[PDB]
Design a protein around this ligand. Structure first.
Ligand SMILES: Cc1cc2nc3c(=O)[nH]c(=O)nc-3n(C[C@H](O)[C@H](O)[C@H](O)COP(=O)(O)O)c2cc1C
Ligand SMILES: Cc1cc2nc3c(=O)[nH]c(=O)nc-3n(C[C@H](O)[C@H](O)[C@H](O)COP(=O)(O)O)c2cc1C
Lengths: 217, 217
């Protein structure tokens, strides 16, 4: 439609139709949206677990325990469930994985252009890893950037979704052995189609007036 | 043209056409995208500065100093420059500004439900400020979610934009007297139309293969 209509009609789904699945085209498009999100320095400090099977989602919903239990039925009833992960540290091999891939895609005309882009990227990586000591919080911010991108992208595809912070990230890091590969769960986003028990599909949307949140200068 | 064509054709603009400005409809649409972004608990832990005048951009461009001087020129040539700000602490009055706004929009059928909604939001807010002590970083992540949704929304509006971390947020907090109001600069996003000197408009996009970043389960 209009991208403003999409932003105004999308909502966090509270109940999913377990009968409605993603089309096989949609199942690949959402993978495109995770991949092609922008990131600072093109660092791409992230990993995704896309659970489509009942066996794989039951593994994710293990994280909806304790205080987060009202999040399990959303992870189980949705068609596909995306887990957004962030790197736990920025290492030079990942920095090298990015520039060597930028080179493979023809972003550099000469090797010397590749080395100044490699060197300049480490100038600002080091300002996070070595100086401010905040590369973990920094990389976690780029993954949230991807979520906002992803939530409006699956909405524009005609899909319902909910972002979830109401999950145990220690349980979900363990189930998929994430900490040892160098990642951490941040947001879990189930995607699919809502059901009649989605009570939020029948409510109006609320936001604060721009006269509170926005300043024109 | 779908949202996947948009996600694949958008780019970070490195040079803007200073003659190409946003239409007055576009200038209100980008304001909607900032307002209607989703947030955890609908906390909306945000503030935006939209600079459209030459003085207003030049005040923002004050933050492009030192190591960030190569950012000044984008902030000046763009049509509109949006500064994304995050709250420095989650206060109980803001939580109530939200509950009271959800009520005014008719999201509650009874007063008891408004108090249970209030009760649920403080159970989870206190888990950030009082238990985990990370509400400042928690709230900064929702702002980064908004940026990621903002970038893909203006792309679908037909606009070129660049997200910026290369700026002094202490200069930019001071220039707008933000720190005393309870806010901090995070990302600066100039929006508009690119110029021929945008070297990034003529390069291919690069992302890591899904076989490295993505796991299907
Ligand atoms: C980072 C983040 C985490 C969220 N976590 C949850 C969650 O755990 N459970 C839930 O029901 N909704 C969750 N939401 C959805 C918000 O409650 C919702 O976006 C907010 O009320 C705005 O409503 P909307 O989705 O209709 O725009 C989350 C949203 C964000 C941005
Ligand atoms: C959080 C964030 C901060 C960024 N800051 C800058 C910046 O300071 N200067 C700049 O030239 N580009 C900046 N970028 C743009 C990145 O270089 C760009 O997203 C990356 O190269 C991916 O390329 P793409 O925008 O064409 O998809 C930033 C991007 C993000 C997501």
């Amino acid at each position: 439609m209009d991208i403003i209509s999409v932003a105004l009609k999308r909502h966090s789904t509270k109940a999913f139709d377990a009968s409605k699945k993603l089309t096989p085209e949609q199942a690949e498009q959402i993978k495109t949206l995770l991949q092609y999100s922008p990131s600072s320095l093109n660092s791409q400090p992230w990993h995704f677990i896309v659970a489509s099977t009942e066996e794989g989602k039951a593994r994710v919903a293990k994280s909806a325990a304790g205080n987060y239990v009202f999040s399990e039925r959303k992870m189980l009833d949705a068609s596909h469930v995306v887990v957004f992960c962030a790197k736990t540290a920025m290492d030079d091999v990942w920095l090298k994985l990015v520039v060597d891939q930028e080179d493979a895609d023809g972003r550099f005309a000469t090797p010397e252009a590749k080395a100044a882009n490699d060197k300049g990227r480490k100038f600002w990586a080091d300002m996070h890893r070595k100086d401010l000591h905040d590369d973990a919080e920094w990389m976690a911010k780029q993954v949230y950037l991807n979520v906002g991108n992803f939530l409006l992208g699956v909405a524009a595809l005609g899909l319902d979704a909910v972002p979830i912070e109401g999950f145990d990230a220690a349980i979900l890091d363990a189930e998929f052995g994430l900490k040892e590969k160098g990642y951490t769960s941040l947001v879990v986003v189930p995607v699919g189609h809502h059901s009649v028990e989605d009570f939020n599909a029948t409510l109006p949307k609320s936001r604060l007036p721009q006269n509170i949140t926005l300043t024109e200068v």
